[PDB]
Q: What sequence folds into this?
DNA sequence: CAGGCATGCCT
DNA sequence: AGGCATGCCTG
DNA sequence: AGGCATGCCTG
DNA sequence: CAGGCATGCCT
């Protein structure tokens, strides 16, 4: 039904949906990085970062893959994650684009991209047709872009979000799903090291 | 008109279970649950998420209600409302569309209906039952408690109980669970002390 | 002739104007106690409080004195001081009443006690004509009653207030002004001594 | 006139800008550091300013407030709110005053918000009112709707608030200004401003 | 009356 | 987090 | 009131 | 590339 709070629970369905991360250079300031322990991606804004998709049984036709952001804390979950006023109106980055300025998550390099603004739930998300890994390849890598900092005032300001990747049936039914925390910042590694470090303190 | 609504655990046919996820244990915490006790400690107006589990729900008309009642039998015959201060107040009454007078509110859903029993007098919030999402076990509801357990003019220092019932389109309880509730500025503090004292009398 | 921000400044005009307080009991449960150190009095909700007023020379015919509350902090200086939503209606002490339960300051005994609401500034004040001191007795004494505790939610909650006594003509201008911090509380003595002693830890 | 003067002009009647005693506490709403004519306040909190004039002015006189970046290069830029604070709803809603304006007046229903046709400059004006009986000060309540640090607006670019009085006619009478700093902790900010100024 | 607690809220 | 406010309840 | 959290800056 | 600073904000 018209679900207002997307659910974020790893649910490898009939096929075995999997979300993995490409090799990543550790550093305070690097395009991106991932924390297997804390299950959360660290990413400079607007820059490129690829996610790995793997499956066993090749999924049914018309099958797609969505990406949606949601706030981690309950106090804020009823709020849809959109871009901040600062970055949305600014031309600095999106005037020649084909994706709506307000959307947080953009897909890079794929014209088949579909930017969804649900009429009822107001939830924004980007979807693409699903496709098998290039011959002799283990993963179907999709290139995502995040257009605001987890700190952006007026947008997701300093409140952690969760990036939900959903494997969907053409009609929208759910075939798979994985989730993980995301943080768009200025210096990823550093925020990670510190976060991994602190985690270890307790 | 009198009611003293029943607060009797009835897991019912469809296995019903309103549970709680892990909340923090901070002096001031939006909310926190004491598995030890039947108490849910939370801050006023905050989002206290509650989990519902069910194995096989069927009525299309089945919906769920939450209604506040006083614990001590002396007052249970008294309707549980909002103090005059928070009702006429401007704070969480401007904007949101819910009755200024109710204590319980559903936060993330607009299908909710706030009902004022014409005879009972009781006030409660009802929302349609929507099953868990593909791959998720619980149907999560978001609740808001508009007054402090301690507000004079309202329930002043009177332990209260929230009763969640899963009824069929028309008054027929498919089951219910109940828990004690305290609304305060500092939930963490009150639990450490509450659970504490309760042990070794 | 309406000002948005009543002045709290004292003003001993042509007629010498001074407002004094009779002997103050130190008891904690005491109905009221005045502090000349802090120039601040402590009351209990709706308890009779004598305010001794004095003039060096007698004033015009129908001139009066008005008691208008005002906040101490600028952050709030604009909020007209009114009775807490709760009290502005609870029937204890209005079914008795003759005055708008909205009004905070009000007199006891005098049936010539008038009230005012500038439709311009919406200010709530009380007015009573200068009846010469009890002939032979220096000060004229008006019995006041302050309806809400300084900590009442919905009203001045825990926000300090100034009690302004203004010497006015039958009309026209102002003729004498004396302000002093107000405070409605349960235990005036308790409170009085606590403030009063902290001022000593300067 | 685009890019106006901050120059001090006491005037026929002596116009003086004064700040009552403020707090020295870190999170105090506002404070003033006499050492450096600089006002520290919090976004949207009530900044009161004491205005004393020697003699009573004409019937059409009034007081206006206008922000102006400090540094040479930036002065040419109009001082408006960042986009986030302008579109965010925190205060804008129900507020009957332009949402782009940095400066706001609080206690007046006769606040006149101005946007210059040629200049584009923004400012708030209020008809002057004589100090009240026995009061040596005429008080105006001012709000500053954007931290100085904000992007999309003052990029941590210092500004001065030039307060001038003018006739009913568009004519200047007196002028005085002081640097402004909108922040979270006024107390802290100044206490630090001075410590380092005490070095050379 | 005066001590003292429960519980909101401030730095 | 630790600690102060402050109404109200004893006794 | 102290300490943190986080974009930009510096070398 | 990481260390440090300035500035909003949390317990
Ligand atoms: Zn942004
Ligand atoms: Zn209440
Ligand atoms: Zn009251
Ligand atoms: Zn801003």
A:
């Amino acid at each position: 039904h018209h679900e207002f709070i997307p659910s974020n629970t790893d649910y490898p369905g009939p096929h075995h949906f999997e979300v993995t991360f490409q090799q990543s250079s550790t550093a305070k300031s690097a395009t991106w990085t991932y924390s297997p322990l804390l299950k959360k991606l660290y990413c400079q804004i607007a820059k490129t970062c690829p996610i790995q998709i793997k499956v066993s049984t090749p999924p049914p036709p018309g099958t797609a893959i969505r990406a949606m952001p949601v706030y981690k804390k309950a106090e804020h979950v009823t709020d849809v994650v959109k871009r901040c006023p600062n970055h949305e109106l600014g031309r600095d980055f999106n005037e020649g684009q084909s994706a709506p300025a307000s959307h947080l998550i953009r897909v890079e390099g794929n014209n088949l991209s579909q930017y969804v603004d649900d009429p009822v739930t107001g939830r924004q998300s980007v979807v693409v047709p699903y496709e098998p890994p290039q011959v002799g390849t283990e993963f179907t890598t999709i290139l995502y872009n995040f257009m605001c900092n987890s700190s952006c005032v007026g947008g997701m300001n300093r409140r952690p979000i969760l990036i939900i990747i959903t494997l969907e049936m053409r009609d929208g039914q759910v075939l798979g799903r994985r989730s993980f925390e995301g943080r768009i910042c200025a210096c990823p590694g550093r925020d990670r090291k510190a976060d991994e470090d602190h985690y270890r303190e307790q």
